[PDB]
Amino acid sequence: ESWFKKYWHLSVLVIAALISVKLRILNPWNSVFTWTVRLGGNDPWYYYRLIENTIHNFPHRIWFDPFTYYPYGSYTHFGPFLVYLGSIAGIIFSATSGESLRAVLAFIPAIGGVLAILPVYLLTREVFDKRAAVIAAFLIAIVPGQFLQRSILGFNDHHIWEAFWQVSALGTFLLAYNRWKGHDLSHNLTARQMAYPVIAGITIGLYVLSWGAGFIIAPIILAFMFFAFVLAGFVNADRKNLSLVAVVTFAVSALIYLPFAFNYPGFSTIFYSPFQLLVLLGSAVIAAAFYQIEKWNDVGFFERVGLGRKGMPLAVIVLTALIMGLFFVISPDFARNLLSVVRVVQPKGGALTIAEVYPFFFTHNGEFTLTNAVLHFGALFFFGMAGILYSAYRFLKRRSFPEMALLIWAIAMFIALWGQNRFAYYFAAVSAVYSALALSVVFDKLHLYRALENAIGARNKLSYFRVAFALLIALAAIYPTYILADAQSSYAGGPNKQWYDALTWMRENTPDGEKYDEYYLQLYPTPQSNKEPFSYPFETYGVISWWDYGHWIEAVAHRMPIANPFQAGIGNKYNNVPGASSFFTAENESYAEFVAEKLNVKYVVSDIEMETGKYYAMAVWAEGDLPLAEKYYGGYFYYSPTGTFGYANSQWDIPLNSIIIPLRIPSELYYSTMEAKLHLFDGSGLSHYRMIYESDYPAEWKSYSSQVNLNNESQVLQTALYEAVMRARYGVSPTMGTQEVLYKYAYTQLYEKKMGIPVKIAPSGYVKIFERVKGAVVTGKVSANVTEVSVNATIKTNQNRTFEYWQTVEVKNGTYTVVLPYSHNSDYPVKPITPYHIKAGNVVKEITIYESQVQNGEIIQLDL
Ligand SMILES: [Mn+2]
């Protein structure tokens, strides 16, 4: 004494900050800074593109990226706030690219998470008191879920800054109301008390300057005033000052958003358009409108004209029935855009999956559960909700304004939370703030503060018995939350070493390698439209793969992806739009080529996820609906009571007591699709596609081969099945590596004909890359008569792995005509180690083609 006081309420913050640093920075550290600076997720990799570019052309940033969504290019909705900030931090730290720049950016979100303590404290202090604000500031440092996972080290996305500035906005706003509250003109603003509404304005503008839909904060604040007016006889507030701090706030923000408000041709809620500029500027006038109504109410306007107690309420109703009712006149657009947020146009979709849009509190299909709330908010959700239900009584009793506004804010975020899993990170602060209020009561009425006060060092009349329970309760709110958090912050996302190495390879092993690096940094102009292919300054080629890996390919390999994580370039079959879905799920080879030529596809990257688990999604996207995607899959594997290899065509034929395998064995159509031909058969039975790179074996299988030979099918089928069942005793599906072996195994024992493009039974590479090629046409007269010409060759990968390439042609008019993709003297690490041993009848030759024919499609003649 007196220390700790008033450093006690300051120490805990520092304690909380250090806990955040422990979670955000220390825990994932070894997973972020590994073989390279490993930015997690997909989104944060795009900023590594946007920052690196904006660094080169400071202080100007791009607003259209023709590098992705090949060959159309997609607009960038990623806000200028992080882009500039990430670039500002980039140049200051004297690092402008590569692993030197990623290392700097990795800290940006973590800092945001630790710094997120302040605005929560400020917000909580303004609607409640300083003792509850402390707890909220502490709980915010340990709240898990998306709010933690997207504030971790290396995950440089714009999500953490949404919540930060949002909470900053509400807090600073309510701060502005509180400092003005009561003080009439002209005490306010007068320089000193102008900072509060101005700062609030800066906060809001900053929010929208980081997230396009940030304008949604505007009606929320309008919603505050709305209920503040219509309940004038039920709730007390300085509506004069409320309106005055509102009109200033929106104006400043609009003034701040203005220089960034014309980066999109037309109105939009996502891209930086003058739409958002309208919402702020509008609400400012709407705010200023509330002023005159109140000042009119002062001199009893609604009392003179005979309206009574319900004068101003019904007045505002109409005045809000109008304005935001005449907005439907000119020009919507606008009205149709504001409605677009409200009118939640679900069900998806779909084509959705998706992963996010699935509602919180509703499993996946489709019961009710709180498991999502637990895994994302720990104990803070249940203390949070309970904290709200209490706050919804303090307002029914004391009827305070800022407590109501916090409730409204809490209501909205829950509504948004209820709709889709995507928006968990907006409810973290809600759960943190309201749990504090819950605990703050528990602490006060179960004494605790006495001791504390009378611990050091007074004398109060307390019960030590209550104090213990108050501590036991705090434990129940802090332990499982932190435990969850400590476990979720221990792993960092991002591409695996199979993907990074393979992409760094493509970076420095593909044509025009110097052109891209030069185009990767050029400040692109902003096209009025982008439905047309982009006019490229050189001979650009496109890389195709599932849209998940669009950002990785662009940021790491420095090439042009057909599809990006913006859900663009996916395409479909139900309308034949050339995309990734219509490509990998293509039935024949011609359809694949149809799409490929439509998009100037040159390289194709496939992985084991696309071969297995993610394939279903590609089918749904392509087909357009889940019932249509069912035909790609068939029956299940099973092992009877006797323990025997089993496959049942129907879900009926499954023996009783038989233990199944949680894995849907694909149908015949699947093996007759591009994704399987490419990955499962390693580019066999194909005319225009040759393999050029292979990642290492999928994780565990490399660890498997520490005591198992890979070519020995009997020694690989053993452990494959062995794992497949030992895991199947539990509810878990086998490893993706093992998922591949079974797909091979099923194919051979089932859908493979007498010899329909056969294959081996062995694990492959996690990531594979193929080059689209014309192919050396090989024609000539047969040995009349004969029916088929079967060409085969042994092919070695860059992992010492060796499969077999095949192709068989229909002989018509005595002249066969085969197209061969692989070449011999290529500088690609995947070269065939044997010549094409062709055969037509009992007569057989042996050709040896080179790239000058293969890539140029030179016709070579061969008779027999
Ligand atoms: Mn994101």
Q: Do residues 164 and 116 both lie within one domain? A: yes
**Nearest partner of 782 among 695, 848, 699, 844, judged by Cα:** 844
Q: Do residues 645 and 791 both lie within one domain? A: no
Using the mean position of ligand 1's atoms as its centre, give its distance from the Cα of residue 86 in Å. Answer: 16
Strand partners, 808: 790
Eight-class DSSP state of 24: I
Contacts (Cβ under 8 Å, ≥6 apart) of 858: 776, 777, 852
Eight-class DSSP state of 600: T
Return the percent helix, strand and coil in the chain, to nearest 5.
Answer: 50, 10, 40
Q: Do residues 782 and 795 both lie within one domain? A: yes
Alpha carbon distances (Å) from 338 to 201, 316, 320? 21, 20, 15
CA distance 622 to 630: 12
Using the mean position of ligand 1's atoms as its centre, give its distance from the Cα of residue 491 in Å. Answer: 18
Pair 662, 731: CB distance under 8 Å: yes
Decide which of 764, 787, 818 is a domain's last residue: 764
Q: Helix or strand or coil: residue 561?
A: strand
Q: Helix or strand or coil: residue 587?
A: coil
Q: Helix or strand or coil: residue 382?
A: helix
String of DSSP letters for 785-833? S-SEEEEEEEEE-TTS-EEEEEEEEE-BTTEEEEEE---SS-SSS-EES
Question: How many C-alpha atoms does 695 have within 13 Å on its Cβ side?
Answer: 27
Using the mean position of ligand 1's atoms as its centre, give its distance from the Cα of residue 25 in Å. Answer: 20
Using the mean position of ligand 1's atoms as its centre, give its distance from the Cα of residue 46 in Å. Answer: 10
Cis peptide before 349 (omega within 30 of 0): yes
Pair 698, 766: CB distance under 8 Å: yes
Alpha carbon distances (Å) from 388 to 124, 383, 384? 13, 9, 6
Pair 402, 408: CB distance under 8 Å: no
Q: Beta strands 601-607 and 767-772: pairing type?
A: antiparallel
Using the mean position of ligand 1's atoms as its centre, give its distance from the Cα of residue 549 in Å. Answer: 14
Q: Residue 186 sits in which domain range? A: 1-494
**C-beta neighbour count of 731 within 10 angstroms:** 7
Angle, CA of 679, 589 and 556, to the nearest 5°: 45
Q: Token digits for 412?
A: 């909205």
**C-beta neighbour count of 729 within 10 angstroms:** 8
H/E stretch holding 694 reads strand 689-694
Using the mean position of ligand 1's atoms as its centre, give its distance from the Cα of residue 154 in Å. Answer: 13
H/E stretch holding 603 reads strand 601-607
Largest distance between two CA atoms of the chain: 112
Overall resolution, Å: 3.4
Q: Helix or strand or coil: residue 344?
A: coil
Burial label for 452, CB within 10 Å (0-12, 13-18, 19+), is: middle
**Which residue type is seen at 18?**
L
CA distance 823 to 469: 76
CA distance 28 to 31: 5
Using the mean position of ligand 1's atoms as its centre, give its distance from the Cα of residue 48 in Å. Answer: 13
Q: Token digits for 601?
A: 């596809």
CA distance 220 to 18: 33
Pair 741, 680: CB distance under 8 Å: no
Using the mean position of ligand 1's atoms as its centre, give its distance from the Cα of residue 160 in Å. Answer: 10
CA distance 470 to 309: 45
Q: Do residues 223 and 195 both lie within one domain? A: yes
Q: Beta strands 601-607 and 776-781: pairing type?
A: unpaired
Backbone angles phi, psi at 33, to 5 degrees: -90, 75
Distance of CA 116 to the CA centre of its chain: 21
Alpha helices in 322-378 (DSSP H): 334-342, 371-377
Annotation: binding site for a glycophospholipid? 77, 158, 422
Using the mean position of ligand 1's atoms as its centre, give its distance from the Cα of residue 525 in Å. Answer: 25
Q: Do residues 181 and 257 both lie within one domain? A: yes
Strand partners, 690: 771
Pair 822, 690: CB distance under 8 Å: yes
Distance of CA 770 to the CA centre of its chain: 27
Pair 194, 249: CB distance under 8 Å: no
Using the mean position of ligand 1's atoms as its centre, give its distance from the Cα of residue 833 in Å. Answer: 45
CA distance 614 to 681: 18
CA distance 765 to 737: 9
CA distance 151 to 147: 6
Contacts (Cβ under 8 Å, ≥6 apart) of 689: 604, 678, 683, 770, 771, 772, 773, 821
Pair 154, 215: CB distance under 8 Å: no
Q: Token digits for 732?
A: 């878990």
Q: Beta strands 689-694 and 815-820: pairing type?
A: unpaired
Q: Token digits for 618?
A: 């590609």
> How many domains are contained in the chain?
4
Strand partners, 606: 768
Annotation: binding site for Mn(2+)? 43, 157, 159
CA distance 433 to 13: 15
Q: Beta strands 659-666 and 633-639: pairing type?
A: antiparallel
CA distance 629 to 619: 6
Q: Helix or strand or coil: residue 278?
A: helix
Q: Helix or strand or coil: residue 861?
A: strand
CA distance 829 to 826: 8
Backbone angles phi, psi at 837, to 5 degrees: -80, 80
Pair 615, 740: CB distance under 8 Å: no
CA distance 33 to 24: 13
Pair 291, 279: CB distance under 8 Å: no
φ/ψ bin of 558: left (φ > 0), alpha (ψ from -120 to 50), beta (otherwise): left
**Which residue type is seen at 733?**
S
Using the mean position of ligand 1's atoms as its centre, give its distance from the Cα of residue 50 in Å. Answer: 14
Annotation: binding site? 43, 77, 157-159, 422
CA distance 270 to 277: 13
**Nearest partner of 116 among 489, 491, 425, 386, judged by Cα:** 425
Eight-class DSSP state of 346: P
Using the mean position of ligand 1's atoms as its centre, give its distance from the Cα of residue 513 in Å. Answer: 29
Pair 603, 543: CB distance under 8 Å: yes
Using the mean position of ligand 1's atoms as its centre, give its distance from the Cα of residue 157 in Å. Answer: 5
The structure tokens 């209501």 sit at 411
Q: Token digits for 793?
A: 């060759």
Strand partners, 75: 64
The structure tokens 């990968």 sit at 797
Q: Beta strands 659-666 and 645-648: pairing type?
A: unpaired
Using the mean position of ligand 1's atoms as its centre, give its distance from the Cα of residue 156 in Å. Answer: 9
Burial label for 390, CB within 10 Å (0-12, 13-18, 19+), is: middle
Q: Helix or strand or coil: residue 327?
A: helix
**C-beta neighbour count of 653 within 10 angstroms:** 12
Burial label for 652, CB within 10 Å (0-12, 13-18, 19+), is: exposed
Pair 423, 416: CB distance under 8 Å: yes
- Quote the radius of gyration of the chain (alpha carbons, Å): 32
Q: Do residues 486 and 586 both lie within one domain? A: no
Q: Helix or strand or coil: residue 341?
A: helix
Cis peptide before 2 (omega within 30 of 0): yes
The structure tokens 């939009």 sit at 268
Using the mean position of ligand 1's atoms as its centre, give its distance from the Cα of residue 43 in Å. Answer: 5
Instruction: Print the SS3 string covering 608-672.
Output: HHHHCCCHHHHHHHHHCCHHHHHHHEEEEEEECCCCCEEEECCCCCCCCCCEEEEEEEECHHHHC
Pair 611, 552: CB distance under 8 Å: no
The structure tokens 């392509």 sit at 622
Decide which of 726, 751, 774 is a domain's last residue: 774
CA distance 469 to 60: 58
Q: Token digits for 102?
A: 């990623």
The structure tokens 């670039």 sit at 87
CA distance 654 to 697: 33
CA distance 199 to 193: 10
Using the mean position of ligand 1's atoms as its centre, give its distance from the Cα of residue 616 in Å. Answer: 23
Pair 560, 71: CB distance under 8 Å: yes
Question: How many C-alpha atoms does 597 have within 13 Å on its Cβ side?
Answer: 9
Q: Token digits for 818?
A: 């085969």
H/E stretch holding 74 reads strand 74-75
Dihedral, CA of residue 328, residue 329, residue 330 and residue 335, to nearest 10: 0
**C-beta neighbour count of 534 within 10 angstroms:** 18
CA distance 274 to 299: 39
H/E stretch holding 480 reads helix 464-488
CATH code: domain of residue 797: 2.60.40.3390
Using the mean position of ligand 1's atoms as its centre, give its distance from the Cα of residue 763 in Å. Answer: 33
The structure tokens 């509060």 sit at 196
Q: Do residues 811 and 736 both lie within one domain? A: no
Using the mean position of ligand 1's atoms as its centre, give its distance from the Cα of residue 106 in Å. Answer: 15
CATH code: domain of residue 609: 3.40.50.12610
Q: Do residues 136 and 41 both lie within one domain? A: yes
Using the mean position of ligand 1's atoms as its centre, give its distance from the Cα of residue 554 in Å. Answer: 16
Q: Do residues 479 and 574 both lie within one domain? A: no
Cα dihedral across residues 66, 70, 73, 78: positive or negative: negative
CA distance 665 to 809: 29
CA distance 780 to 784: 12
Using the mean position of ligand 1's atoms as its centre, give its distance from the Cα of residue 75 in Å. Answer: 16
Eight-class DSSP state of 732: P
CA distance 111 to 858: 59
Q: Token digits for 714?
A: 């009997």
Q: Do residues 244 and 185 both lie within one domain? A: yes
Pair 79, 209: CB distance under 8 Å: yes
Alpha carbon distances (Å) from 160 to 146, 485, 555, 817? 9, 16, 22, 59
Dihedral, CA of residue 458, residue 462, residue 468 and residue 471, to nearest 10: -60
Using the mean position of ligand 1's atoms as its centre, give its distance from the Cα of residue 159 in Å. Answer: 6
**Nearest partner of 496 among 356, 617, 607, judged by Cα:** 607
Using the mean position of ligand 1's atoms as its centre, give its distance from the Cα of residue 304 in Å. Answer: 55
Using the mean position of ligand 1's atoms as its centre, give its distance from the Cα of residue 537 in Å. Answer: 31
Alpha carbon distances (Å) from 838 to 401, 683, 835, 849? 85, 18, 9, 12
CA distance 89 to 91: 6
Q: Token digits for 770?
A: 């193929």
Q: Do residues 379 and 463 both lie within one domain? A: yes
**Nearest partner of 228 among 155, 148, 287, 182, judged by Cα:** 287
Alpha carbon distances (Å) from 298 to 250, 301, 303, 309, 564? 25, 8, 10, 13, 57
Using the mean position of ligand 1's atoms as its centre, give its distance from the Cα of residue 150 in Å. Answer: 8
Pair 538, 568: CB distance under 8 Å: no
Angle, CA of 527, 533 and 539, to the nearest 5°: 110
CA distance 155 to 105: 9
**Which residue type is seen at 70?**
Y
Pair 273, 63: CB distance under 8 Å: no
**Which residue type is seen at 9?**
H
Using the mean position of ligand 1's atoms as its centre, give its distance from the Cα of residue 400 in Å. Answer: 37
CA distance 176 to 169: 10
CATH code: domain of residue 745: 1.20.58.1650
Using the mean position of ligand 1's atoms as its centre, give its distance from the Cα of residue 566 in Å. Answer: 10
CA distance 317 to 6: 47
Using the mean position of ligand 1's atoms as its centre, give its distance from the Cα of residue 42 in Å. Answer: 8
Decide which of 461, 494, 527 is a domain's last residue: 494
Using the mean position of ligand 1's atoms as its centre, give its distance from the Cα of residue 177 in Å. Answer: 33
Q: Token digits for 383?
A: 């203390």
Q: Do residues 676 and 821 both lie within one domain? A: no
Using the mean position of ligand 1's atoms as its centre, give its distance from the Cα of residue 81 in Å. Answer: 15
Question: How many C-alpha atoms does 848 have within 13 Å on its Cβ side?
Answer: 4
Using the mean position of ligand 1's atoms as its centre, give its distance from the Cα of residue 153 in Å. Answer: 15
Pair 698, 785: CB distance under 8 Å: no
Using the mean position of ligand 1's atoms as its centre, give its distance from the Cα of residue 269 in Å. Answer: 16
